[PDB]
Amino acid sequence: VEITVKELLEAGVHFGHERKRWNPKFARYIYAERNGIHIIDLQKTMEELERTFRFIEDLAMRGGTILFVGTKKQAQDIVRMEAERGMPYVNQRWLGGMLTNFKTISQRVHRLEELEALFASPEIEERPKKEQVRLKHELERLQKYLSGFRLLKRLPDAIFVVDPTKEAIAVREARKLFIPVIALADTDSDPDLVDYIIPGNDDAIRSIQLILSRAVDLIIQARGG
RNA sequence: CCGCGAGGGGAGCCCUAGCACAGGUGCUGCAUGGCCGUCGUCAGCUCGUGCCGUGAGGUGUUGGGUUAAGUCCCGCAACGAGCG
Ligand SMILES: [Mg+2]
Ligand SMILES: [Mg+2]
Ligand SMILES: [Mg+2]
Ligand SMILES: [Mg+2]
Ligand SMILES: [Mg+2]
Ligand SMILES: [Mg+2]
Ligand SMILES: [Mg+2]
Ligand SMILES: [Mg+2]
Ligand SMILES: [Mg+2]
Ligand SMILES: [Mg+2]
User: Which residues touch strand B (CB under 7 A)?
Assistant: First the structure.
């Protein structure tokens, strides 16, 4: 399982953004501009996807956990399902602090582990029917935001983010903690902040869908089966 | 209590003299405790960690909707917690 220059075209991976939004630093990853939009050099994308996948692989081979990040409405369900098949992910909201204030965030994990505990329990039917609903609500939100974070029992060995310029909170945090950043990066982004880059469309389903799967494909390849 | 007894000593209480002292709704609420009136049963006041800033400090608590309500919802560098 590697990836064809062809398959990448079909994904529409090389379709960049308009020329308006644009990070000149990113120029080193561009073929040319057709009708307003920069077209990402796939001959490059491919040779970076290699250096990058080679990292992902050995990291996985050594047991590392990779935190997947996508807030964008396009990604969400792709990040989710892809992660699961076996890492943690963030796909609802990036709660500022999740990495650098990891402790007091994971505190919120034990809260829902403990509210999960309380709803399987008899002791719930005790509380007045008002706290009862107001406690189911507390639990509910926690599951929303944390259903993927709750797998992290310590900081990731690397984070893999979809769209670094959307996420550069998440990114900032990683770099401050010396965790390697991997990203699917479009032309709007500072590639200098990305330790392990994949330049290509950070926008279309058909694009992310391809990348994330082949990543994950590679992961459980090099986890023994 | 001592004595066979006359009786001496002693506890308690009393009076007189003298000494510690008691008594004072005399001052200072601008030396205070306690308690109370008040803004105000108004929805506010803050803290841990993270984050922003050289810094005082900010963030959170703000914004949009909702509520008797910092009541809840969505949002968001914030996630919570304490007094309310
Ligand atoms: Mg973008
Ligand atoms: Mg006798
Ligand atoms: Mg006698
Ligand atoms: Mg006196
Ligand atoms: Mg006074
Ligand atoms: Mg007076
Ligand atoms: Mg500082
Ligand atoms: Mg306030
Ligand atoms: Mg009230
Ligand atoms: Mg409250």
Answer: A 93-97, 100-101, 103-105, 107-108, 137, 141-142, 169, 172-173, 176
Q: How far, in Å, is the CA of A104 from the C1' of nucleotide B47?
A: 15
Nucleotides of strand B lying closer than 7 angstroms to a protein CB: 48-52, 72-80
**Which listed CATH number (3.30.565.10, 3.40.50.300, 3.90.1150.10, 3.40.50.10490) goes with A28-94+158-225?**
3.40.50.10490
State in Å: Cα A220 to ligand 9 middle: 57
CATH architecture of A95-146: Orthogonal Bundle (1.10)
Query: Is there a contact between A141 and A124 (Cβ–Cβ < 8 Å)?
Result: no
Give the tokens for residue A135.
């406690």
In Å, what is the separation between the CA of A141 and the C1' of B73? 12
Resolution of the experimentally solved model in angstroms: 3.5
Please tell me the distance from the alpha carbon of residue A123 to that of residue A21, in angstroms, as a whole number.
55
Burial group, residue A57, by CB count within 10 angstroms (0-12, 13-18, 19+)? middle
